[PDB]
Amino acid sequence: NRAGRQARIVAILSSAQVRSQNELAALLAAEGIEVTQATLSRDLEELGAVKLRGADGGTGIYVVPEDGSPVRGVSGGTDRMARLLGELLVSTDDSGNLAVLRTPPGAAHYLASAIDRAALPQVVGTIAGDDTILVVAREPTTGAQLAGMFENLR
Amino acid sequence: ANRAGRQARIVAILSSAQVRSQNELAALLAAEGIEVTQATLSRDLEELGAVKLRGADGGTGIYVVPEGVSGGTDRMARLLGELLVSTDDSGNLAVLRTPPGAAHYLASAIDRAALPQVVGTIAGDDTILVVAREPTTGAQLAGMFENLR
Amino acid sequence: NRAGRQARIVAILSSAQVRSQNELAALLAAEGIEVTQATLSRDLEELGAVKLRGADGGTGIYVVPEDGSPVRGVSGGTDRMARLLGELLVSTDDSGNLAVLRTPPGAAHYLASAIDRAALPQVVGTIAGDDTILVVAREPTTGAQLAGMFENLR
Amino acid sequence: NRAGRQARIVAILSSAQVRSQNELAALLAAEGIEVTQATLSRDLEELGAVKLRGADGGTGIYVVPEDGSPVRGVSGGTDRMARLLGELLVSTDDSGNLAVLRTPPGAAHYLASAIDRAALPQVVGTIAGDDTILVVAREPTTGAQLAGMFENLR
Amino acid sequence: ANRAGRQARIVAILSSAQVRSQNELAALLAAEGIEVTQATLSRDLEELGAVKLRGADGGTGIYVVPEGVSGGTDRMARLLGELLVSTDDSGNLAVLRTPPGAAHYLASAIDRAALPQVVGTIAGDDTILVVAREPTTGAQLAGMFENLR
Amino acid sequence: ANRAGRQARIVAILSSAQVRSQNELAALLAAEGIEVTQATLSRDLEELGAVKLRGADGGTGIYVVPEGVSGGTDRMARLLGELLVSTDDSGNLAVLRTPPGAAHYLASAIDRAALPQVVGTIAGDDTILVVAREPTTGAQLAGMFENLR
DNA sequence: TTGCATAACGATGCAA
DNA sequence: TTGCATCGTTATGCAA
DNA sequence: TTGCATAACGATGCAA
DNA sequence: TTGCATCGTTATGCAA
DNA sequence: TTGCATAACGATGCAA
DNA sequence: TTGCATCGTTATGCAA
Ligand SMILES: N=C(N)NOCC[C@H](N)C(=O)O
Ligand SMILES: N=C(N)NOCC[C@H](N)C(=O)O
Ligand SMILES: N=C(N)NOCC[C@H](N)C(=O)O
Ligand SMILES: N=C(N)NOCC[C@H](N)C(=O)O
Ligand SMILES: N=C(N)NOCC[C@H](N)C(=O)O
Ligand SMILES: N=C(N)NOCC[C@H](N)C(=O)O
To answer: Which PANTHER family does the protein's record reference (chains A, C, D)?
Structure first.
């Protein structure tokens, strides 16, 4: 199935050097498993696979971090956001496509900045006031779902 | 902090926020390093005479109490490790730098500490001007911030 | 009916010391009137009844203010908001779940703060720019309804 | 048809001095063309016709600018906005009734101010954070349509 | 104010706001204490040469006029009772405190008064720095604010 | 600028914005006067070792590079024509005025230039306070700004 | 004095 | 509008 | 000069 | 697109 | 070194 | 969930 294909992908990547998704499709094909690039795109996105390279390092090869870090540049953005939510998030709420977050006075800009830097797929953008942040959910995510996601980190 | 200090913080918290529940109050307290349970907050609010106030057709209510602050500078010192990138000075001004967006948060904590050598603060986005009370200089203020770290 | 039940409630409260809604249900029952706690919750909310107590005052008893004040702490939040709307609100408008309020330059924060402090049931939160405030309506209230409510006070 | 009626209107205005739409209806009637005030309102709005007058100049007469300026006061609110969008707009996006615009750090207020001053018919209002602007679309315009309009100027 | 002063305010108002109607203009004027009816505003705007301007497919239009201010300091003094919590100073700075969020509003009114002894202002959320023009000191500025109350 | 300078700007740009595409990077660069095509940016980002980073279920990614600035003051000088309405001073402060809303944008560019004679800046809405490093005076700073125009 | 576990209490979406 | 069922919110007996 | 009351004027949701 | 009906917005005769 | 044109590559709305 | 078809995004051979 899917989770089996993905296990094979984490394996094929750590052992080989895949530079493209079509390339990973052929690597899976010779191994019996047949998938399209479309699906691998989805898998790698779920896997958190990142096309890596060093300075002057040309086209990268895919690699999934083992909760080990992306060298130097943390990913990291999300963990930092989670820490600041735990510290600064006072309440969450929602209406339509909006999650509304409250913070202590003056803290909204700092928390919103942390959320922007996490670059969440379901967030179109944020605006901070002084103690309130409007977070715009990317369709079809609702404000209520976005809010629940923030709540779970509160 | 202890009962009396925590309750002073609570009064401060309730005047600047709109607190709908003891759970919210706990989150506001935890933001300044104070961690207590809902049972304690129930007791604090009773001792304080705090009431969950609402008008006509007014929903569920918010807590208010009828009519410096303890740990004030410790709340401020607490944030310096996180939010103080650097200090500097010129004449009667200390100039503090913070991560992007953090200036108002740290400046608010400086204000609440109500230091007698500080006339006031203004925050931009990543910079705070702290105005020294004569004859204290900006340099001394900066030194105070560096020492509270 | 309802308004009759409520008249009795304003009466039962000023004469007795009701510490719970179930208690007010029994006080109404012995008086013939049968209601559930659910309805009393709604009535007290409409009535603006507040569970009052002094310092170290234990569990409160319900009391409805007679446009007399809630001692020291004004309610009060609403009147102040209404005054600042009259003074600072330049225009109201709406879209979807949003009321959009305009103020003179620089006044938006101050007006938004007043609205937050009123803690209106139909407002999820506010964000102030410099001369514009976005007010997020709590479902099912629409932005247009919220805006009309602010208009009425303009 | 319509574009023919409008060509006649640009003509009737530059040659005569029309002080009201009902007046422009009679001027078109004597010329065969029959329309209501409602339609002329729509035409003049599309035409960009403006009721002009000088200081102490009483009731104005309609005039459509020939990309020549409205004397002194630029109409140019729009041109200025277009210039600043070209300079400052980093990306556009949308959700529901919202267009979300991103700018370099610190530029959001300045760009949002420019958009306000353009007073676009399909914009209810704007709020600026530091690098993000929420633009509220006036129903029935969607956020996506608003965003595309800004994209076109990016 | 009278005709000439009110019309000066109107010009100032029309350049910083986007005014779609005379009703809006009345609300903007009422915010700075000036109360007149729509009839008077119709007449003011005519005397001013103000036009309701719009481009192509441009909607209903906003008022603009082609090409200190009267009562400027009175508009500022007007707000002090409301918005001035306290004044203080240090060197060339006066430090004003306001209710939460009110700093930009009061600072804007200070700016419009264009006092010759004031180089400029910066507002945070509840604090304004007013920069004194040499050799005026912050203390004298603070005294001026206290006296205008 | 040339390869090395442009790439320095890119590093600065990538740390303060969340850049999802080379197209976005081009818009950010164009905002500070640098115009290059996507092909060049592809090459810049490769030379920089920049990676399009994302976590688990993390969407499409944003560019980051592992681990003052060239043309810094020219970026600042660039904006003065647009954004500097006037300069003035008092003691250790230069006071800059900008069009409404522009203060943060110009102050950010001043900060990035990192002038040794400038301790820091605070922006309001239309005013910037630039704090002079002793013994430089606010007047000299103002003169520097007027000369960079 | 506090936390814990639980009881008492108040609010609310849904169907009628 | 209400009641029902249920859930979020607040109070409190007991151990430490 | 201003407010009041009202008339003149322009804009707009709805059906066709 | 247009017209109808209507409403929000702006101009103006008269009393003071 | 860069731009241009184009190829290679990755993401995604829709139907199944 | 997947594949298809397609589109937005990124890489690269060649002229200058
Ligand atoms: N500005 C202060 N002190 N409070 O007002 C905040 C208003 C609004 N919730 C906002 O966050 O924009
Ligand atoms: N606004 C952004 N992102 N940066 O600019 C900050 C300018 C200035 N140091 C201040 O803190 O006001
Ligand atoms: N910042 C100035 N001066 N005006 O711009 C305001 C932009 C936007 N309406 C806002 O209120 O955020
Ligand atoms: N304040 C800084 N430096 N960044 O935070 C931005 C938060 C949010 N996108 C906003 O524009 O309000
Ligand atoms: N932002 C809030 N809520 N308070 O902080 C204000 C800090 C400082 N006095 C200033 O007015 O900038
Ligand atoms: N906020 C507006 N619209 N004006 O007020 C500006 C006040 C002050 N000069 C500052 O720039 O902070």
So the answer is: ARGININE REPRESSOR
